């Protein structure tokens, strides 16, 4: 039986999005049908990489199921997790991405952030998370408590450092601000290790899968 | 979390300068925070005085702009607040409070474009006469 | 600009009543919302749009309707009598914040 996705589409299913909220996934399925593109998918403006090829990977899966990567009650504990936009919302209350958490200052500071995961799932783990970009430098130190920023994320078979560009744009959604979304797959018994000091779309809910 | 405790001569001659200390503590005062100040007059309304962020950044009543510096030691973990050519006006009980950081921007989570101060101190009174 | 707010009201005990402040600066930030009893700092029990601070009970209620905030007080009890501030910050120039003038409320009955 195919994933039905319903009145929403593949990314704001896999994000978490709090409109695509309730829509009880499988644990296996032959294709995916949806109805794409309510607004891109991401109630957050933002750019999805490489979000062609995880369609393709997501197409046919056998044993499917959503756990949590980082506990949102400990594994930050220094930092603040109840981040909410006006452009996430559900039920006219605002909200986030139900697997994902945006990370800002706890009591004035934002300390030097270190995760990690190991994939004892004896399958392919799909971790997402992403990066935040402010409009202006003034609300960057408000929210990060930083002027430079940098977040590592590295497993065995991935290794990137993104760094926040400050810039004006026009209102999407309402929202000035940018989040870009990644993804990376993690083989059985590979470790990813994310580490951060701010701007860090920190993940909360992750996949394993497998034919991925 | 984080304590407030203002400290301060209680007596401050005519036209003198009268000068206040707060400390923090449970916290570091180099942090994402707007530390204020608030004075009330006997019998009279809240006036809120000025903020101060680390990085030097200032921001003033207009109508005490001239009259009043709030600086900041680090070593010390505490703000200060400092007014010049006090009269009876200056007479009150003043406060220093906790004020959270806020966006000019619609790129900030929600909370971040509320105004409040949730910590406050316990409030020095400061007597202007000779 | 600057907040205006009554500087008396009375609610008999048990009732409901509700605390005005107006003012230009209303429309672009959030205002918030103090209670201060004689002699004693004041202490914050709404801000944002409707959120109250752990410990302040839920007959506290804080509502915005264009350039005006309004705090309700639903069940008034004895413990209620305060002077009640409202509280914003501007939307324009170097963000300067102002005080609403205070409102004494008193419980009658």
């Known amino acids: 039986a195919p994933l039905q996705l319903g009145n929403c589409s593949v990314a704001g299913w896999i994000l978490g999005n709090p409109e695509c909220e309730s829509l009880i996934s499988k644990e296996s399925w032959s294709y995916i049908v949806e109805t794409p593109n309510p607004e891109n998918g991401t109630c957050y403006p933002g750019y999805f990489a490489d979000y062609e090829e995880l369609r393709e990977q997501l197409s046919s899966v056998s044993s499917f199921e959503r756990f949590e990567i980082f506990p949102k009650e400990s594994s930050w504990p220094n930092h603040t997790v109840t981040g909410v936009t006006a452009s996430c919302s559900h039920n006219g209350k605002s909200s986030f991405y139900r697997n994902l958490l945006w990370l800002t200052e706890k009591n004035g500071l934002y300390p030097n952030l270190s995760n990690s995961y190991v994939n004892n799932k004896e399958k392919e783990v799909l971790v997402l998370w992403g990066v935040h970009h402010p409009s202006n430098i003034r609300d960057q130190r408000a929210i990060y408590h930083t002027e430079n920023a940098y977040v590592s994320v590295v497993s065995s078979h991935y290794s990137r450092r993104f760094t926040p560009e400050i810039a004006k744009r026009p209102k999407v959604r309402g929202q000035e601000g940018r989040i870009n979304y990644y993804w990376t797959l993690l083989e059985p018994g590979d470790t990813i290790i994310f580490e951060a000091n701010g701007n860090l779309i920190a993940p909360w809910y992750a996949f394993a899968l497998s034919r991925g | 979390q984080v304590q407030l405790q203002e400290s301060g001569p209680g007596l401050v001659k005519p036209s003198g300068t009268l000068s206040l200390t707060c400390a923090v503590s449970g916290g570091s005062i180099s942090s994402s925070n707007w530390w204020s100040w608030v004075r009330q007059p006997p019998g009279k309304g809240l006036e809120w005085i000025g903020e101060?962020?680390?990085?030097?950044?200032?921001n003033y009543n207009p109508s005490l702009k001239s009259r009043v510096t709030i600086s900041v030691d680090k070593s010390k973990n505490q703000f200060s607040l400092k007014l010049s050519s006090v009269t009876a006006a200056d007479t009150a009980v003043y406060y220093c409070?906790?004020?959270?950081?806020?966006?000019?921007?619609?790129?900030?989570?929600?909370?971040?474009?509320?105004?409040?101060?949730?910590?406050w101190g316990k409030g020095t009174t400061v007597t202007v006469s000779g | 600009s600057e907040l205006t707010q009554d500087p008396a009201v009375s609610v008999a005990l048990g009732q409901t009543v509700r605390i005005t402040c107006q003012g230009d600066?209303?429309?672009?930030?959030?205002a918030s919302w103090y209670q201060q009893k004689p002699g004693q700092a004041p202490v914050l029990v709404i801000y944002g749009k409707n959120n109250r601070p752990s410990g302040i009970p839920d007959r506290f209620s804080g509502s915005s309707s264009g350039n005006t905030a309004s705090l309700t007080i639903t069940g008034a009890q004895a413990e209620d009598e305060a002077d009640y501030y409202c509280?914003?910050?501007?939307?324009?120039?170097?963000?300067?914040?102002?005080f609403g003038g205070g409102t004494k409320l008193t419980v009658l009955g």
């Open positions: 600066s209303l429309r672009g930030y959030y």
């Open positions: 509280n914003s910050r501007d939307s324009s120039g170097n963000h300067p914040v102002v």
């Open positions: 409070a906790r004020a959270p950081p806020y966006c000019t921007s619609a790129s900030c989570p929600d909370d971040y474009y509320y105004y409040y101060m949730d910590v």
């Open positions: 101060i962020y680390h990085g030097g950044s200032t």
